Every structure is written in structure tokens, then in C-alpha cells.
Amino acid sequence: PDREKALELAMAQIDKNFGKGSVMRLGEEVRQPISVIPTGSISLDVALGIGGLPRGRVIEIYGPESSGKTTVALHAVANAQAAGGIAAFIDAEHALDPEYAKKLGVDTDSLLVSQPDTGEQALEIADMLVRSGALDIIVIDSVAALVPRAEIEGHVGLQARLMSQALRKMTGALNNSGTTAIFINQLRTGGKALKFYASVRLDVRRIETLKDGTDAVGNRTRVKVVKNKVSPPFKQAEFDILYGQGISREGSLIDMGVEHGFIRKSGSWFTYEGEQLGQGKENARKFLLENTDVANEIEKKIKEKLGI
Ligand SMILES: Nc1ncnc2c1ncn2[C@H]1C[C@H](O)[C@@H](COP(=O)(O)OP(=O)(O)OP(=O)(O)O)O1
């Protein structure tokens, strides 16, 4: 009996008994499902190992206030609509700002918003909305907002039960309807289930503010995919979020362009194929915000260096 020859046997046996990736080898680069929703963050896309948030799965995005979570989600919503999709936003926080949303790429006019009254209602109308197999993506702002019917009237019970049940009924559905479900989870609750239901769990934290000059613009966010059942987990990804513009695609190409030698630094003087872009990230960002085919080439070049 041979070791490696006997590991892959059982290993492939466990998958056939529980799932596609119930046992992964962190090293694996394996990729054969595609159908992903770009998050608008290149580093994060590769970080997920499949280019984007899978489709037909529940996804958790947790983190503290002002971390970027909602932005990633809104970003997901855009790329989703852009390629002819329908997005439903079950709001229970009442924090959404259409101005900022549209400025990210979302089609607000055609965005379905619902402001459930009870937490049970939200999960009902959210499931109901999914079962119609028409939605591409659906985001539920605030797991913590989904408060049980009571407590809004006369320790005494549980909410994590409300979540459980809802997920159990809903998991099946969105799975064979190809509708991705983003659950915003702002905190540092009843998610004692979503942790096992989710096939992908994102951990967003605001690494540090972006100097820029006098005052600041946006922040630098770090996302650690602690759970990923489609690809190998524990991957990380950083990216900039300008305040008022959202995630910076441009800023992605650099942080990413240098980690792969496509762009070079001649002493805080970024350059590509001979010609230079500027002196200092913020400056080389602008350079790319003007010439787009130059970026379209670098962007094109990195999607070729890795899974596509
Ligand atoms: N209304 C807005 N106007 C301008 N900039 C905004 C606005 N809302 C958010 N931003 C920018 C700056 C914020 O630091 C950044 C992150 O936004 P947000 O999507 O609010 O992150 P988040 O999901 O961690 O926060 P929250 O837990 O409140 O949902 O987006």
C-alpha cells in the first residue's frame, strides 16, 4: 500500500461524500468552475482563487465599522448588474447612500430595495425573492439588524435560531438558482450558523489611513479570506478605497503590478516598459486614471499571469 497513492484515494472519497472541496491541500491552484462576480478588487479576486465571489453560495463579509465591507458588496452588485443581472438589497440598517452607490457603478433606479419590519420578515421576503430565480446577487445589510419578531414586543430564546432556520430553507434555493448571497456582518450574535453555512467568509479590517497630503482621502483595507470552500483559504488581499470614489482599480494595478515585476521602481519613480508613470504611488495612480489602454494592457497582463 502506497501513501500518496492511498491518500488521494480516500481524499477523493471524502469529496464524493460531502462536497467539491471538503478537503483541500493549501498548495493546490486547481480551478474549474468560473462563473464569478468580480469584486472590482483584483488582488481580492485572485485572493479568492477563482476571480470573484462564487455564484449560488452564501457569503459573509464581516468586520468593524467603516472597514469597506458594504463597499465590496456594493461593488459586487455593480459588476453583477453590468453583465445583465438583477440585484436585491434587503436593508435593515437604513444606512445606504445611493449617491455613493451610483458613484461606484450601481444601477440604483433598477435596484430592488426592501426595508423589512421584522428580522423574520427580512429572511422571508429575501428567500421569497430568491426562489423566483431572477436575482443574480442579493445583499442583506446587517445580520445584527435581523432582530426576532419579539424583543420588538414582550436569555429569553434565541435569534441564532431564526438565522439557522432561514439559512437551512434558503441555502438550497440560491444554490440551484445561481444567486450569490452577501450577508453584511458589522461587529467585533446569531451568526453562529452563518459561519458554517457560508462557503466563503471574508474578514475585512481597516489596516491604515491613506496620507495623500494635507488631510486624507480613503483608507487601506485588508481582507483575509478565513473560509473558502471553493479554493484554498487563508489568502489575504489589500487594496485602497478612496473616499467618495470607492475601490481603486488603478491602485490595484500598481500594488499588484510591482509584486509581479511588470512595473518597476527606480527610487520611488514607478515605470512600465521604459516610460515612467510618476514619483510616488498617488502620482502614478493619476497617470493611469488618464491613459486607459496602458492600464488595459497591464490589467490584461496580470489576468494572464494567473488563473483566468
Ligand atoms: N456616504 C458616503 N460618502 C462618501 N464616502 C463614503 C460613504 N460611505 C462610505 N464611504 C467610503 C469611506 C468609508 O470609510 C468607506 C467604507 O464604507 P462602508 O461601505 O461604510 O464600510 P463598511 O461596510 O465596513 O462600513 P459599515 O459596517 O458601516 O457597513 O467608504
Report which secondary-structure segment, H or E, holds 300: helix 292-305
The tally of domains found in the chain comes to 2
CATH of the domain at 282: 3.30.250.10
Same domain, 59 and 138: yes
Strand pairing category for 180-186 and 58-63: parallel
Pocket of ligand 1 contains residue 65 by CB under 6 Å: yes
Interval between CA 10 and ligand 1 midpoint (Å): 46
Same domain, 176 and 276: no
CA-to-CA separations, 183 to 123, 202, 225, 232, in angstroms, rounded: 11, 10, 15, 21
Pocket of ligand 1 contains residue 186 by CB under 6 Å: yes
Domain membership of residue 110 (yes or no) is: yes
Residue pair 41/238 in contact by the 8 Å Cβ criterion: no
Pocket of ligand 1 contains residue 97 by CB under 6 Å: yes
Q: Is 171 annotated as a binding residue?
A: no
Q: Which residues contact 161 (CB under 8 A, 6 or more apart)?
A: 190
Give dist(CA 186, CA 143) in Å, integer.
8
> What range defines the domain where residue 240 resides?
24-247
Q: For residue 301, with 0-12 CB atoms within 10 Å meaning exposed, 13-18 middle and 19 or more buried, which class applies? A: middle
CATH of the domain at 153: 3.40.50.300
**Experimental determination approach used:** X-ray
Same domain, 170 and 266: no
Pocket of ligand 1 contains residue 70 by CB under 6 Å: yes
Same domain, 256 and 234: no
Q: Is 240 left (phi over 0), alpha (psi -120 to 50) or beta?
A: beta
Same domain, 195 and 252: no
Resolution number, Å: 3.3
Interval between CA 68 and ligand 1 midpoint (Å): 6
Domain end marker among 247, 263, 294: 247
Same domain, 193 and 269: no
Same domain, 168 and 204: yes
Give dist(CA 90, CA 88) in Å, integer.
6
Give, using CA atoms, the residue closest to atom 8 of ligand 1: 100
Give dist(CA 19, CA 252) in Å, integer.
33
Same domain, 155 and 303: no
Same domain, 60 and 112: yes
